[PDB]
């Protein structure tokens, strides 16, 4: 049965809801990104009306197979109308094709569900400038204080400048990149352009790429592991043991391996700044833990509500428990107070 936070009332809508079965009442189900938690149910077999933006409707056809009939892609920016209520989509700056959904209701309710997001000050001068919000569904991953990481192009310089300076000193060294679903693709790509290589991958990996409408991607991957210095790997070989076994496998080519770890949060970002982070060592293998984030810190997070202004909040993630839930409430009421809305 699909949780409240789910459902947009008023209308026909769910949002993210695809494990439920037939939900009574949905008559159009959206699906901000194509990330497993949010698209689990979905199949080659689901025939109800899926609403989303261009790439995720990309990935939906090719990765999952759903037929094309019921995939309907929204251009984003655009005013569109569904079964007679007008939406908007908006860019989440979380993975490829991520949105946000405005929902203006039929009763002059604004509803803004944010699905995953990191927020940035460039979202002040979105469509949502021009309007008032009376309710929001907000993603709450990283919702206390502690949860501080710096951003994203202080995490690829990093990155960047460790792999040039590694394999200049030996330019038989590998890098090696761990992926487990779409996101965080600029970490390879940044480091590919440093070196002057493709990036190498599986051919199941390049073919979720190739839904991705990324400029210029048939000139920064391939299929051919021997012409590339930089390898995908799943997340889970990302550790000494399957190094070592893929290290193997390149036929004398390579006699070291630098692998990088996107996580998010980590505890090691309550001590130490991204310039003086190091590596895990075993003889001829590195391995760097970067905390590239597609989620809101607390900061940002709190500069987005208290620049929205909110009547209600309603958090779509941490609400399994009543001291998460707790936590959460006490710090909206403190943004409320700071803020005086
Ligand atoms: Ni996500």
């Avoid at 460039?122 to 206390?144: F, G, I, N």
């Avoid at 990088?260 to 991204?274: A, D, E, L, M, V």
Wanted: proline share 5%.
């Amino acid at each position: 049965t699909c949780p409240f936070y789910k459902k947009i009332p008023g209308t026909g809508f769910t949002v993210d809801a695809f494990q439920y079965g037939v939900v009574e009442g949905c008559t159009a189900y959206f699906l901000t990104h194509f990330h497993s938690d949010h698209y689990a149910g979905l199949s080659k077999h689901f025939t109800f009306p899926v609403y989303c933006s261009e790439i995720t409707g990309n990935l939906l056809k090719n990765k999952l197979h759903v037929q094309e009939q019921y995939i309907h892609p929204l251009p984003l920016d655009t005013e569109c109308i569904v079964n007679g209520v007008k939406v908007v989509l908006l860019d989440a700056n979380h993975c490829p094709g991520a949105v946000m959904i405005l929902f203006y209701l039929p009763n002059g309710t604004v509803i803004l569900h944010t699905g995953d997001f990191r927020a940035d000050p460039s979202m002040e001068r979105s469509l949502l400038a021009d309007q008032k919000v009376h309710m929001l569904y907000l993603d709450t991953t990283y919702c206390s204080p502690e949860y501080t990481f710096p951003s994203q192009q202080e995490v690829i310089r990093f990155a960047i400048n460790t792999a040039f300076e590694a394999v200049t000193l030996n330019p038989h060294a590998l890098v090696v990149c761990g992926t487990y679903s779409i996101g965080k693709e600029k970490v390879f790509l940044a480091i590919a352009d440093v070196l002057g290589s493709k990036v190498g991958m599986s051919q199941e990996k390049y073919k979720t790429l190739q839904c991705l409408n990324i400029p210029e991607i048939n000139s920064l991957i391939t299929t051919d592991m021997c012409s590339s210095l930089v390898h995908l790997l799943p997340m889970m070989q990302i550790n000494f043991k399957g190094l070592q076994s893929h290290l193997k496998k390149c036929g004398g080519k390579y006699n070291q391996i630098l692998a990088f770890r996107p996580t998010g949060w980590t505890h090691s970002n309550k001590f130490t700044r991204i310039a003086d982070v190091i590596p895990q060592t075993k003889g001829n293998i590195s391995i760097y833990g970067i905390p590239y984030s597609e989620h809101s810190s607390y900061l940002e997070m709190k500069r987005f509500v208290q620049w929205l202004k909110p009547q209600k909040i309603i958090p779509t993630v941490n609400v399994g428990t009543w001291k998460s839930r707790s936590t959460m409430e006490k710090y909206f009421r403190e943004w409320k107070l700071e803020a005086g809305y």
